[PDB]
Amino acid sequence: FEIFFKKDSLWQSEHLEAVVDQDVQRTCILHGPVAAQFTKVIDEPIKSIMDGIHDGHIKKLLHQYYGDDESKIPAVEYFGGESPVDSEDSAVFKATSSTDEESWFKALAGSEINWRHASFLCSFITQDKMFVSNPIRKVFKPSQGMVVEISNGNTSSKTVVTLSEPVQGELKPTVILKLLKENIIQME
Amino acid sequence: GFGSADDTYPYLTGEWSTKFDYPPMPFDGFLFGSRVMIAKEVKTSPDAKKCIAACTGVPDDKWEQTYKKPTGGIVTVRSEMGEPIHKIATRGVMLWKEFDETIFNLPKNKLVPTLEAKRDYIISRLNADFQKPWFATVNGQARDLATMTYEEVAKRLVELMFIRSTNSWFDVTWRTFTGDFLRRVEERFTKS
Amino acid sequence: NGNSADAAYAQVEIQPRANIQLDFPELKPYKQVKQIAPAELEGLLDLER
Amino acid sequence: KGSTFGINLIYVNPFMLQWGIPLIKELRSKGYPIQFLTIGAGVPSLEVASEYIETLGLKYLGLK
Amino acid sequence: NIFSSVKCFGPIKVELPTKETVEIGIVDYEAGASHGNPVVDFLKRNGSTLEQKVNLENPIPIA
Amino acid sequence: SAGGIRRPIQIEEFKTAISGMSDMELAQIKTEIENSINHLQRSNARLGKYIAKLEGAGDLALYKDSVRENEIVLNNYNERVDALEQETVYRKTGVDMDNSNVDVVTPNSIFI
Numbered sequence: 091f092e093i094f095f096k097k098d099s100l101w102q103s104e105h106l107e108a109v110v111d112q113d114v115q116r117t118c119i120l121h122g123p124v125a126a127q128f129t130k131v132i133d134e135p136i137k138s139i140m141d142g143i144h145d146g147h148i149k150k151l152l153h154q155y156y157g158d159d160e161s162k163i164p165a166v167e168y169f170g171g172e173s174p175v176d177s178e179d180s181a182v183f184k185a186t187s188s189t190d191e192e193s194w195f196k197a198l199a200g201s202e203i204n205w206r207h208a209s210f211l212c213s214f215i216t217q218d219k220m221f222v223s224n225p226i227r228k229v230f231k232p233s234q235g236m237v238v239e240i241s242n243g244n245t246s247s248k249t250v251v252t253l254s255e256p257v258q259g260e261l262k263p264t265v266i267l268k269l270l271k272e273n274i275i276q277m278e
Numbered sequence: 279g280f281g282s283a284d285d286t287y288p289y290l291t292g293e294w295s296t297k298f299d300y301p302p303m304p305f306d307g308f309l310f311g312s313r314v315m316i317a318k319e320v321k322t323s324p325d326a327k328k329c330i331a332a333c334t335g336v337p338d339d340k341w342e343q344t345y346k347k348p349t350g351g352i353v354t355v356r357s358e359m360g361e362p363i364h365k366i367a368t369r370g371v372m373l374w375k376e377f378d379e380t381i382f383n384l385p386k387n388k389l390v391p392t393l394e395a396k397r398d399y400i401i402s403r404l405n406a407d408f409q410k411p412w413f414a415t416v417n418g419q420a421r422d423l424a425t426m427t428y429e430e431v432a433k434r435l436v437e438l439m440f441i442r443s444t445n446s447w448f449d450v451t452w453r454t455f456t457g458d459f460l461r462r463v464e465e466r467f468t469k470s
Numbered sequence: 471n472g473n474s475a476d477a478a479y480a481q482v483e484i485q486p487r488a489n490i491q492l493d494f495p496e497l498k499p500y501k502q503v504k505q506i507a508p509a510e511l512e513g514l515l516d517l518e519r
Numbered sequence: 520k521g522s523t524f525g526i527n528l529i530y531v532n533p534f535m536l537q538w539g540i541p542l543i544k545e546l547r548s549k550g551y552p553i554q555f556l557t558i559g560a561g562v563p564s565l566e567v568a569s570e571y572i573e574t575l576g577l578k579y580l581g582l583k
Numbered sequence: 584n585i586f587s588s589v590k591c592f593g594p595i596k597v598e599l600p601t602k603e604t605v606e607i608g609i610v611d612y613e614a615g616a617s618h619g620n621p622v623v624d625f626l627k628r629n630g631s632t633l634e635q636k637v638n639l640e641n642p643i644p645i646a
Numbered sequence: 647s648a649g650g651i652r653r654p655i656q657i658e659e660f661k662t663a664i665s666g667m668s669d670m671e672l673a674q675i676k677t678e679i680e681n682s683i684n685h686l687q688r689s690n691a692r693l694g695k696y697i698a699k700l701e702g703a704g705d706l707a708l709y710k711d712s713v714r715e716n717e718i719v720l721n722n723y724n725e726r727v728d729a730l731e732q733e734t735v736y737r738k739t740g741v742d743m744d745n746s747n748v749d750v751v752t753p754n755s756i757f758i
């Protein structure tokens with residue numbers, strides 16, 4: 091009896107059409123005692139709710155720790171992808187058989203958070219909706235002979251990073267990773 | 279037990295743990311389940327949202343009252359496993375709570391004897407209150423499955439499993455259940 | 471037609487199960503029962519005997 | 520384009536774990552945007568959790 | 584798996600007493616939503632190819 | 647293994663899961679649940695002493711519902727060992743001289 095009675099008790103509240111008399115009072119609705127004392131307004135858009143709580147935290151955090159002044163908030167290009175564990179304008183790097191991968195990509199990325207920083211430390215990128223491994227780190231994965239040259243390193247908008255390798259003896263340019271028009275990274 | 283910035287800000291800042299004579303102890307973010315059950319674009323049926331909005335609730339000092347009696351419009355009832363669940367105290371759930379205190383807490387050797395004794399009570403209450411009604415009622419009259427005709431069964435499977443408003447079977451597996459039963463009727467009553 | 475118009479061609483059959491009956495006697499409607507016996511018989515027999 | 524979401528799997532339901540862990544590993548190897556996996560209703564053993572941590576290409580594991 | 588349209592066609596030839604061939608027919612099979620080419624399925628069973636591979640009893644290692 | 651986790655699990659979902667496993671994975675779950683049972687019986691033994699000591703004469707109704715509670719969990723474990731037992735057993739199984747036949751009086755019956 092206990093199984094028959096209790097078996098599959100949680101869909102009914104979403105589908106009253108399929109309950110005798112379309113009667114809520116028959117039904118199991120899951121809800122917290124304490125949290126119930128804030129659930130007052132029916133059919134509030136989820137964005138309105140979740141923003142409410144977030145914009146509430148800012149309004150306050152701003153008051154305590156930034157003397158009610160948005161101008162004191164550190165600006166960054168893009169917020170995200172920081173594992174919770176951890177300036178030169180015209181440089182030249184030279185991969186060996188020793189060069190550690192993590193060190194090598196810190197260097198190319200540089201200090202500032204911009205398109206170059208993403209390009210070399212973003213582990214993933216998006217084709218349409220899917221998440222493919224970052225091809226720009228595949229290409230620049232270091233090995234004996236490959237020679238990176240950065241130019242305008244300290245002004246993102248014109249920075250150019252230019253990989254060169256051995257090609258039929260001599261050393262020629264094989265990749266040219268840069269900005270086109272403002273929001274497009276070309277990897278020629 | 280979170281709903282706004284105001285109750286959740288002391289946990290962001292670390293100052294919640296000051297109240298208990300500890301040093302500040304701040305948290306890296308929050309989760310809101312219960313809060314978000316009445317949002318515009320969940321599937322919770324309108325009448326259920328009204329039922330949620332009606333639950334007054336209770337502060338953290340008092341929430342453990344739920345193990346005894348409806349507290350802010352909310353009780354705890356045991357699952358089939360004995361895990362607590364926090365549910366709004368609808369008629370349904372109050373019946374569930376009654377049967378936890380009376381029938382399901384009995385040892386196995388007292389269980390079947392008690393069901394025979396309380397049978398007509400249990401059926402009145404399933405039909406009146408609970409989301410799963412007693413199967414074998416025809417025209418509001420509580421039978422048993424052995425005192426129902428093959429027709430009375432077919433007609434009642436359709437009543438409980440087929441939705442007249444949408445004109446469809448709630449779940450295809452339910453349609454296969456009734457279809458299998460009609461195929462039994464043919465097997466049982468055909469000569470050839 | 472692969473096994474699409476040579477596989478959905480085939481129907482479902484009902485093998486009968488045994489519905490053993492008690493064979494209680496068929497009771498006819500009253501109007502048909504009064505043909506069989508003569509009309510004078512009503513109230514004439516002591517059914518206790 | 521670029522959005523993610525996650526997946527809750529009840530630990531005390533051995534059947535959902537049996538079809539659902541392989542389903543993530545599969546969809547995550549095709550690059551579906553599944554940022555993380557919360558295991559509800561329990562905490563797995565070290566040897567299990569170790570297999571979730573290494574084998575499903577997840578950003579983080581939720582534990583309740 | 585299902586074909587939108589199947590089409591088999593070609594000359595039918597007869598070997599004459601002299602062993603010159605002559606056209607005496609045409610294959611003209613056309614279909615809509617089909618799962619197969621029946622013409623080739625027919626000729627595989629009821630006919631033969633001009634050449635027939637025959638396996639040695641034992642494969643011989645050359646090198 | 648998520649079957650045998652020292653905590654009560656719903657038996658319908660256990661039975662279904664247990665179907666799809668290898669025989670050595672079943673053998674592992676069975677070992678694990680048996681060990682859980684032994685831990686609960688050695689726990690219920692200790693609880694049996696502190697009852698028998700105190701029943702020699704509050705904080706006795708508490709020792710009593712600690713052993714009532716262990717029997718709820720223990721019922722789930724041996725309900726789980728029974729499903730394992732059932733799954734084990736499923737894997738094992740899957741002259742004539744009268745002219746009645748030929749009429750030899752007739753010319754054509756022989757083989758005309």
Ligand SMILES: Cc1cc2nc3c(=O)[nH]c(=O)nc-3n(C[C@H](O)[C@H](O)[C@H](O)COP(=O)(O)O)c2cc1C
Pocket residue numbers: 120121122125279280309310311312313527529558559560583
């Ligand atoms: C309707 C409802 C369903 C829930 N379902 C699950 C679940 O399937 N798995 C789970 O781990 N937690 C579940 N929870 C718990 C939430 O994940 C979370 O712990 C809780 O809602 C937060 O508490 P609050 O409701 O007091 O805000 C559920 C909570 C509610 C209200």
